[PDB]
Design a protein around this motif. Structure first.
Motif, PDB file in Angstrom:
ATOM      1  N   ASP A  96      15.534   6.396  -0.059  1.00 14.92           N
ATOM      2  CA  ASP A  96      14.779   5.380  -0.779  1.00 14.92           C
ATOM      3  C   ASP A  96      15.477   4.025  -0.670  1.00 14.92           C
ATOM      4  N   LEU A 106      13.773   7.376 -17.125  1.00 17.87           N
ATOM      5  CA  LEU A 106      14.602   6.189 -17.007  1.00 17.87           C
ATOM      6  C   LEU A 106      13.853   4.893 -17.217  1.00 17.87           C
ATOM      7  N   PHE A 117      13.710  14.198 -17.749  1.00 20.35           N
ATOM      8  CA  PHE A 117      14.586  13.048 -17.856  1.00 20.35           C
ATOM      9  C   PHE A 117      13.863  11.800 -17.402  1.00 20.35           C
ATOM     10  N   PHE A 138      22.976  23.342 -20.918  1.00 15.67           N
ATOM     11  CA  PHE A 138      24.009  22.330 -21.075  1.00 15.67           C
ATOM     12  C   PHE A 138      24.400  22.172 -22.535  1.00 15.67           C
ATOM     13  N   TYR A 188      18.236  12.537  -0.648  1.00 13.64           N
ATOM     14  CA  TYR A 188      19.641  12.595  -0.242  1.00 13.64           C
ATOM     15  C   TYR A 188      19.913  13.482   0.982  1.00 13.64           C
ATOM     16  N   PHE A 208      21.612  29.525 -15.072  1.00 13.01           N
ATOM     17  CA  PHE A 208      22.192  28.229 -15.381  1.00 13.01           C
ATOM     18  C   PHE A 208      21.206  27.078 -15.242  1.00 13.01           C
ATOM     19  N   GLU A 239      15.259  19.109 -12.082  1.00 11.28           N
ATOM     20  CA  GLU A 239      15.242  19.558 -10.689  1.00 11.28           C
ATOM     21  C   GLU A 239      16.634  19.972 -10.214  1.00 11.28           C
ATOM     22  N   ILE A 293      26.940   9.208 -10.959  1.00 13.23           N
ATOM     23  CA  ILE A 293      26.082   9.740 -12.005  1.00 13.23           C
ATOM     24  C   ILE A 293      26.908  10.284 -13.170  1.00 13.23           C
ATOM     25  N   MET A 339      23.709  10.844 -23.310  1.00 12.76           N
ATOM     26  CA  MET A 339      24.780  10.189 -22.571  1.00 12.76           C
ATOM     27  C   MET A 339      25.885   9.849 -23.548  1.00 12.76           C
ATOM     28  N   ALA A 352      23.397   6.349 -17.470  1.00 12.29           N
ATOM     29  CA  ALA A 352      23.321   7.578 -16.697  1.00 12.29           C
ATOM     30  C   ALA A 352      23.694   7.257 -15.256  1.00 12.29           C
ATOM     31  N   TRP A 368      22.942  15.774  -6.730  1.00 15.74           N
ATOM     32  CA  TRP A 368      23.330  15.657  -8.135  1.00 15.74           C
ATOM     33  C   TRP A 368      23.746  16.979  -8.792  1.00 15.74           C
ATOM     34  N   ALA A 369      23.070  18.066  -8.434  1.00 15.66           N
ATOM     35  CA  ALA A 369      23.384  19.375  -8.998  1.00 15.66           C
ATOM     36  C   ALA A 369      24.634  19.962  -8.345  1.00 15.66           C
ATOM     37  N   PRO A 377      26.594  13.160 -15.195  1.00 18.50           N
ATOM     38  CA  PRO A 377      26.956  14.585 -15.196  1.00 18.50           C
ATOM     39  C   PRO A 377      28.270  15.048 -14.532  1.00 18.50           C
ATOM     40  N   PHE A 419      22.548   3.705  -4.263  1.00 15.64           N
ATOM     41  CA  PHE A 419      21.970   3.126  -5.466  1.00 15.64           C
ATOM     42  C   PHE A 419      22.954   2.218  -6.202  1.00 15.64           C
TER      43      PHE A 419
HETATM   44  C1  LIG Z   1      20.952  13.806 -16.519  1.00 14.09           C
HETATM   45  N1  LIG Z   1      20.865  13.889 -15.050  1.00 14.09           N
HETATM   46  C2  LIG Z   1      21.077  15.112 -14.377  1.00 14.09           C
HETATM   47  O1  LIG Z   1      21.011  15.212 -13.155  1.00 14.09           O
HETATM   48  O2  LIG Z   1      21.367  16.274 -14.991  1.00 14.09           O
HETATM   49  C3  LIG Z   1      21.625  17.482 -14.293  1.00 14.09           C
HETATM   50  C4  LIG Z   1      22.950  17.796 -13.856  1.00 14.09           C
HETATM   51  C5  LIG Z   1      23.209  19.022 -13.171  1.00 14.09           C
HETATM   52  C6  LIG Z   1      22.143  19.942 -12.920  1.00 14.09           C
HETATM   53 CL1  LIG Z   1      22.454  21.462 -12.091  1.00 14.09          CL
HETATM   54  C7  LIG Z   1      20.822  19.626 -13.349  1.00 14.09           C
HETATM   55  C8  LIG Z   1      20.563  18.399 -14.035  1.00 14.09           C
HETATM   56  C9  LIG Z   1      20.555  12.672 -14.253  1.00 14.09           C
HETATM   57  C10 LIG Z   1      21.704  12.268 -13.276  1.00 14.09           C
HETATM   58  C11 LIG Z   1      21.378  10.950 -12.524  1.00 14.09           C
HETATM   59  C12 LIG Z   1      20.017  11.115 -11.758  1.00 14.09           C
HETATM   60  C13 LIG Z   1      19.684   9.887 -10.915  1.00 14.09           C
HETATM   61  C14 LIG Z   1      19.319  10.115  -9.557  1.00 14.09           C
HETATM   62  C15 LIG Z   1      19.006   9.052  -8.689  1.00 14.09           C
HETATM   63  C16 LIG Z   1      19.049   7.726  -9.156  1.00 14.09           C
HETATM   64  C17 LIG Z   1      18.717   6.573  -8.222  1.00 14.09           C
HETATM   65  N2  LIG Z   1      17.613   6.883  -7.298  1.00 14.09           N
HETATM   66  C18 LIG Z   1      17.943   6.596  -5.852  1.00 14.09           C
HETATM   67  C19 LIG Z   1      17.418   5.180  -5.435  1.00 14.09           C
HETATM   68  C20 LIG Z   1      15.850   5.130  -5.537  1.00 14.09           C
HETATM   69  C21 LIG Z   1      15.298   6.100  -6.646  1.00 14.09           C
HETATM   70  C22 LIG Z   1      16.343   6.238  -7.795  1.00 14.09           C
HETATM   71  C23 LIG Z   1      19.410   7.474 -10.518  1.00 14.09           C
HETATM   72  C24 LIG Z   1      19.728   8.551 -11.400  1.00 14.09           C
HETATM   73  C25 LIG Z   1      18.848  11.481 -12.737  1.00 14.09           C
HETATM   74  C26 LIG Z   1      19.201  12.797 -13.495  1.00 14.09           C
END
Ligand SMILES: CN(C(=O)Oc1ccc(Cl)cc1)[C@H]1CC[C@H](c2ccc(CN3CCCCC3)cc2)CC1
Ligand SMILES: CN(C(=O)Oc1ccc(Cl)cc1)[C@H]1CC[C@H](c2ccc(CN3CCCCC3)cc2)CC1
Ligand SMILES: CCCCCCCCOCCOCCOCCOCCO
Ligand SMILES: CCCCCCCCOCCOCCOCCOCCO
Lengths: 619, 619
Positions: free
Chosen positions: A367, A598, A596, A120, A411, A425, A430, A252, A33, A297, A160-161, A254, A356
Motif C-alpha cells: 500500500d 483506527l 480494531f 490477550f 506485507y 490462541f 486477522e 506496532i 493501548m 498503536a 503483525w501476528a 503488540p 508506514f
Molecule cells: C492491535 N493490533 C494487533 O495486530 O493485534 C494483534 C496482535 C497479534 C495477533 Cl496474533 C493478532 C492481533 C494492531 C497492530 C497494528 C496494525 C496496523 C497495521 C498496519 C498499519 C498501516 N497500514 C499500512 C499502510 C497502508 C494501510 C495501513 C497500521 C496498524 C493494526 C492491528
C-alpha cells in the motif's frame, strides 16, 4: 464557488507540514493501548506517578455515560476494552467504589466477566497473576523449529501476528507472574452468575488444535523439555535480528510490548536491545491538551506525507512547488533497500519498497510503496536521477509482490494459508495477510499514472481479480478503511486510471450504488457497524473523508457533472471550517474488520482536498 | 618525615576523584589503535576531517627521531605498529616524500616490508585492497558449529580472542574490499630486497594446520558452501547477544571494531546494534591538550576506583570516610548479577563478579572482583545489608572460579587448551587464558582480609600453585603487570596476608632478590624488555609504581625496618611532585608479554600511596 474552499484547504495542509517536509497526524484506536502500557510498566517495574496521572485522565475522558469503552466513537460497549481499562484504573488508584468503577464492573459482570474476554486480555491478567496460565492458549517456543514449507511455521502468519507469536513463545515458555499489590487485586471480575460466553477461533475450532493445546499444557508440566533452551534462543535470536531502528518491532504496539517482557524474563534488562526498545516508546506517546497522555498503536508519517502530496497536487500546486519538493526529497530518503521477511518468498526481488512509519526496514508494505512512488511520479525534483531511479526500484518491487490471484497483499506474497485461523490462541482480528481489493486498487492507480494500461498482463490479472471480488450490489469491500465507500471509491478510481471503460455494466452498477447511499445532508457516511451487520452497508453519519471517497468514485465514472455529484461537493464546502480544515468525530479507518478500528487524523483534511482537486479537474 | 609526602599524596588522589565517586585514569598503548580507527572510518565511510587532524598530530607526536613507533616508551622500533601508522598518515594527507614518511618507510623496508607484519596488520591492508586475501590465515564461519567439548571450539580461546574470531569469521567469509583512493595506495610497502622474515604461530606451526589453511582458501573458492549462510547467522546472533551495554563488545578495541565491519558487510548499518555500537566509540576517545586525539584499547574505571580506595585506606582515611563511601556505594551498583560466558564451565555458579570497565556484564574478571570485594571489605557503608550481601556473592564467585591447579585465570576456568596456540591466524599475543600467579596472589590477599588462613583447602591448593611456579632466583613472573617486581611483590604481599610464615626459605629467597635489584637512586625499576631478554629481569629506570611494589614485598617480609626499605621510601618522598602526585614516563602495565604493553595512569599515584600507607603501618 468551491475554489475558496480549496484555497483555504490548501494553505491549511501546507501549514500542518513539519519542517523536515513531511506530514504526520496522530493515529487513534482504543484504550487497550494505554491500559496495557500501564501494566507493562508494572512488569518492568518502571512506574512514573506523573505519567500514571495523565493516563488516568485519558482513560476516564474516554469512558462513556454507561461507564464503558468501545472500539470506536459511538460504538457498542466492548468487554475486553473495558476489562483492561478497569484493571488499569484500579491499579493507578481508583477504588472499586467510585461511580465510574461501579458502572464498568456491572457491565463486565452482565457479560460473564473475565471468562468471556479475548485470549490477550486473559493473558495480560495471567502475567499479573489474576488468571490461571493453564486456561490460556499455549504457544510453545518449539514453534521455531517448523521449516519454511511446513504447517504453521511462523511465515504462515501475517507480519503483525508473526513477530508477536515469536515473542510470546518465550513468554509462555516460562509463564512468569508479576503479582499486583493487594490493593489492586481484581477478584470481582469473576463474581458473576451470567454464563461465560467465550469467543472461539476466528475460523472455527477444529477438535485437533483443541486437543493439541491441552497436550501442550500437559507437556508444559513435565520436568524436562528437550531442546526447549535451543527453541527459546531461536526465538530470542529472531527478535534481536529484526528490531526496528526506533527501537520497536514492526512499528506496532503488540510485538513491541511483548518483546520487552520476553527480555525482562531473560534477565536482559541491561542489554542494548532492551534499553533501546524501552526509551523508544516515548516517540509513540502523545500529550493531550486536557492533561491526558496516549500511546499510538502505530505511527503514519510516510502515509500522511504520501497522501498529503497527491492531494495538494490534484489540488493545484506546481509539480515543482518548493514546498512539495521538501516532501519529495524526504520520501526518497525513506525507500528501503534491504531484504525483509517478504524476501523469504521472493529471494530474487530487488528491495525498493517503503514503510508506514519512520524507520522500519524489514516490513515495507505494498500500500505505502504504491502511494509513495505514485506521488513522486507527480513531482519534479532537483535530482531527476534519484527520482527516476527511486520510482523504478519501488515499481519493480510492487510488481514482484503480486500474488497468485492477481491481487496484492499488504506485507507478504500469497500469505493465504488457512491453517492459523483455527489455533486456540488466534481469536482476535486477522492473523493472515491475503490480497485485498483496496491495496490492489491503489497499486493499479499507481501504474495508471505511468500509463501502463489494460493491455499489460499484470494489470489484466488484477482487474480480473477485482471483477470476481465485486459484491452483488456492485460495491467493493473495504479492508484497511471503513468500508464499502472506501473500497468502491478506490476501485472505480483505479479502473478509470488503468484505461478500463467507465461505461461498462459492472462499473455503472457501482456508481448507482454510490448515488443511492447519499445522505440527506448531501454527504456520505458509513458507520463501522458495516463490518458486523450488512444493514449499515454505506449507511452512517456523513464524514468529510467518506464523502470525498464516494465523490471520487463519481468523478471517475464521468458522473462528475451530476446531481448527487454537485450535491456532495456542497457538503464539503459548507461543513468546512474558518481555518480551512474539517472535523470528523468518527473513525474511517480499519485495522481488523469488526475487531480494531483506527482514526487517521489527516484523512479529514487530505481527502476532501484531493476530491475537490479532482472535481475542479472535471471542468 | 614521610607523613607530609603521604598527606600530599592523599589530598591529590581525593582531588582526582570524579563526582559520581569513582576514579578513572586513561589507559595507554600504541598507535595501532588510532591507526586502525582511521581505517575503520574509511570502511564505514564516516571520515571527519576535523578528527583526522587531531589523529595526525597524535601520530606524528608519538613518532621518534628515527621515524618509527614502538610498543612502549623508549622501546625498540616495531614493524607492525609503524606499518599501520605509516598507512594511516598517508591516508590522512601525508605525502610519501616528507621527512616522517621517508624515515618510516626506510625502516619498513629494512625489515622486509609488509610481508613481515603480523597477521592482523596484513588483514587490515587486505580490507582496503593493498594485500591479497589469499595470503591471510583463514578463519571460516563454520567454526561456529564446533560443540562445547570439541577441538578448537570458540570456548577454547580466551575471552578477548573469542569474540574477535566470531566476528572475523563473518568478515573473512565474504573477504570484502574497500579500495583506497589512488592518492593513498601504498605499493612502496613491497619495494624491498630484504628477505621477508615472517612471524610464525605463537606455539609453533604444525604442518596439519598449515595444510588445512590451504584447504580452506581452496574451499573458499568453490561455487557453493553448504550451510555457510547458517554458520554466518550463527556467528551474527552470537554477537548480537553479547554486545556490551556501552555498545562495545567485551569492552576492548579489537572485537568491537571487527564486529562493526561485519555488520556493515551484512547491510545492517540501519540496525540498532550497529548504531549503538558506533556512537559508543566516543566514550573511549580522549582529547589531548596539544590538539591530538587518541582512542583507548580499553577503559579502567572499576580498577582505578578499586585500588584508589584500598590505597587511601592503608594510608589512613576512616573506613566510613564520606568520600570513600561515594566509592563504596558506586562499586556496589557495579556488581554483575547475570550469567556470562564463564557460566559455560560453571552452570551452577551464582553471578557476583565485577568488570574492568563501566558496563560489561558478560565478562567479569577474577582480578577486578577480588580487588573490589577486598576494597569493600575495608569500608563501612550505611547499608550494611548490601555491603555484607555483595561481598558474599563476589566471594563465592571467586572461589567457584579457581582452576584445577589451584591457580586463578582472569576470565574463564581451566582455559588451558594448547590447541589454539598453533593456528596460522594466531601469531600475535596470548590466545588462551590460563591461571597466573598475580591474579591468584590478589585473590589470596582478598580472602586474607577476611581471615581465611592456610587451614582452608582452597588457600593451600593456591599456595602450592605459587610455590611450584616460583622462579629459580626466587622471583615471580608478572603477567598483567611489568614484571617480576610486580609479581614478586604481589605474591609475598599475599602470602603474608594468608598467614604463611614470612621466615620460610623460599620467602626470604624472594626478599633478597628484591634488595638485589634496588637501583642506586634508591628506587626500583624493571624495563618491559624483561619479557624478551632475561638480562632486564628487575633491571630498568626507577618508577614510582615499580618501587612501591618492590617496597610492599619488603614491608610484608618483615624487612620494613631495613636499609633497602628505608632507602626506597626516600626515593618516593623526594621524586614526589609539589602537587602531591608522581610522574612515570614509562609503562608498568602488561597486555601480552612481549607483544602489548599498557600505561595505567593511576598506578603512579595510587601505588606509591598504598606503599607509604603500609610503611607507616610497620611503625
Ligand atoms: C492491535 N493490533 C494487533 O495486530 O493485534 C494483534 C496482535 C497479534 C495477533 Cl496474533 C493478532 C492481533 C494492531 C497492530 C497494528 C496494525 C496496523 C497495521 C498496519 C498499519 C498501516 N497500514 C499500512 C499502510 C497502508 C494501510 C495501513 C497500521 C496498524 C493494526 C492491528
Ligand atoms: C590489542 N589487544 C588484543 O587482544 O589483540 C588481540 C585480539 C585477538 C587475538 Cl586472537 C589476539 C590478540 C588487547 C585487547 C584488550 C586487552 C586487555 C585485557 C584486560 C584488561 C583489564 N585487565 C583486567 C583487570 C585487571 C588487569 C587488567 C585491559 C585490556 C589487552 C590486549
Ligand atoms: C547472515 C547472512 C545474511 C544473508 C541473509 C540475506 C538473505 C535475506 O534474508 C532472507 C529473509 O529472512 C528474513 C530476514 O531479514 C532480516 C534481517 O536479517 C539480518 C541480516 O542478514
Ligand atoms: C537464552 C537462554 C536463557 C539462559 C539464561 C539462563 C542462564 C543459564 O546459563 C546458561 C549459560 O549460557 C551461557 C551464555 O552467556 C551468554 C549471554 O547471552 C545472553 C542470553 O542468555
Amino acid at each position: 464557488a468551491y475554489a475558496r474552499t480549496l484555497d483555504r484547504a490548501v494553505e491549511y495542509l501546507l501549514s500542518c507540514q513539519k519542517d523536515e517536509g513531511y506530514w504526520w497526524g496522530p493515529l487513534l484506536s482504543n484504550v487497550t493501548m494505554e491500559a496495557e502500557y500501564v501494566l507493562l510498566c508494572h512488569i518492568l517495574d518502571r512506574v512514573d506517578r506523573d505519567r500514571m496521572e495523565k493516563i488516568r485522565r485519558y482513560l476516564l475522558h474516554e469512558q462513556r455515560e454507561d461507564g464503558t469503552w468501545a472500539l470506536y466513537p459511538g460504538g457498542p460497549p466492548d468487554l475486553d476494552t473495558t476489562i483492561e481499562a478497569y484493571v488499569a484504573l484500579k491499579y493507578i488508584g481508583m477504588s472499586r467504589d467510585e461511580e465510574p468503577m461501579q458502572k464498568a464492573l456491572r457491565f463486565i459482570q452482565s457479560q460473564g466477566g473475565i471468562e468471556s474476554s479475548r485470549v490477550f486480555t486473559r493473558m495480560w491478567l495471567a502475567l499479573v497473576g489474576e488468571y490461571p496460565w493453564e486456561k490460556v492458549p499455549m504457544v510453545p517456543p518449539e514453534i521455531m523449529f517448523l521449516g519454511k514449507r511446513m504447517p504453521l511455521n511462523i511465515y504462515e502468519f501475517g507480519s503483525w501476528a508473526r513477530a508477536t507469536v515469536v515473542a510470546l513463545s518465550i513468554v509462555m515458555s516460562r509463564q512468569p507472574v508479576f503479582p499486583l499489590p493487594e490493593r489492586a487485586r481484581v477478584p470481582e471480575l469473576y463474581e458473576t452468575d451470567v454464563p461465560p460466553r467465550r469467543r472461539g477461533a476466528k475460523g472455527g475450532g477444529g477438535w485437533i488444535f483443541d486437543a493439541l493445546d491441552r497436550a501442550l499444557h500437559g507437556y508444559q508440566k513435565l520436568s524436562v523439555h528437550p531442546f526447549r533452551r535451543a527453541a527459546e534462543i531461536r526465538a530470542l535470536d529472531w527478535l534481536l535480528e529484526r528490531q526496528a531502528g526506533d527501537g520497536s518491532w514492526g512499528g506496532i504496539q503488540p510485538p513491541w510490548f511483548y518483546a520487552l517482557i520476553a527480555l525482562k524474563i531473560l534477565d536482559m534488562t541491561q542489554h542494548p536491545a532492551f534499553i533501546k526498545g524501552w526509551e523508544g516508546l516515548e516517540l509513540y506517546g502523545v500529550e493531550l491538551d486536557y492533561g491526558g497522555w496516549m500511546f499510538q498503536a502505530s505511527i503514519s508519517p510516510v502515509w500522511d506525507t504520501g497522501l498529503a502530496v497527491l492531494a495538494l497536487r490534484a489540488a493545484g500546486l506546481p509539480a515543482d512547488h518548493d514546498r512539495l519538493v521538501k516532501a519529495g526529497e524526504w520520501l526518497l530518503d525513506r525507500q528501503i533497500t534491504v531484504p525483509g521477511d517478504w524476501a523469504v518468498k521472493r529471494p530474487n526481488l530487488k528491495p525498493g519498497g517503503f514503510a508506514f512509519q519512520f524507520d522500519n526496514v524489514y516490513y515495507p508494505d505494498v500500500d505505502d510503496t504504491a502511494v509513495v512512488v505514485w506521488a513522486l511520479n507527480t513531482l519534479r525534483l532537483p535530482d531527476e536521477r534519484r527520482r527516476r531511479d527511486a520510482m523504478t526500484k519501488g515499481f519493480r518491487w510492487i510488481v514482484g509482490m503480486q500474488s497468485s490471484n492477481g491481487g496484492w497483499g499488504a506485507y507478504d506474497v500469497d500469505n493465504t494459508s488457512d491453517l492459523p485461523n483455527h489455533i486456540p490462541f488466534c481469536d482476535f482480528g486477522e492473523v493472515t495477510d491475503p490480497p485485498s481489493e483496496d491495496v490492489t486498487a491503489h497499486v493499479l492507480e499507481c501504474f495508471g499514472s505511468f500509463g501502463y494500461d489494460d493491455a499489460w498482463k499484470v494489470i489484466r490479472r488484477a482487474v480480473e481479480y477485482l471483477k470476481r471480488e465485486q459484491k452483488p450490489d456492485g460495491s467493493w469491500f473495504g479492508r484497511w478503511g471503513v468500508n464499502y465507500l472506501y473500497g468502491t471509491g478506490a476501485v472505480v478510481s483505479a479502473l478509470k486510471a488503468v484505461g478500463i471503460d467507465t461505461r461498462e455494466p459492472y462499473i455503472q452498477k457501482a456508481l448507482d450504488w454510490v448515488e443511492q447511499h447519499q445522505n440527506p445532508d448531501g454527504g456520505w457516511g458509513e458507520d463501522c457497524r458495516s463490518y458486523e451487520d450488512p444493514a449499515y452497508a454505506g449507511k452512517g453519519a456523513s464524514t468529510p473523508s467518506q464523502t470525498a471517497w464516494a465523490l471520487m468514485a463519481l468523478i471517475a465514472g464521468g458522473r462528475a457533472e451530476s446531481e448527487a455529484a454537485r450535491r456532495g461537493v456542497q457538503y464539503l464546502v459548507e461543513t468546512q471550517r474558518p481555518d480551512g480544515g474539517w472535523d470528523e468525530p468518527y473513525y474511517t479507518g480499519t485495522g481488523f474488520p469488526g475487531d480494531f478500528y483506527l482514526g487517521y487524523t489527516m484523512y479529514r483534511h487530505v481527502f476532501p482536498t484531493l476530491a475537490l482537486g479532482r472535481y475542479k479537474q472535471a471542468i
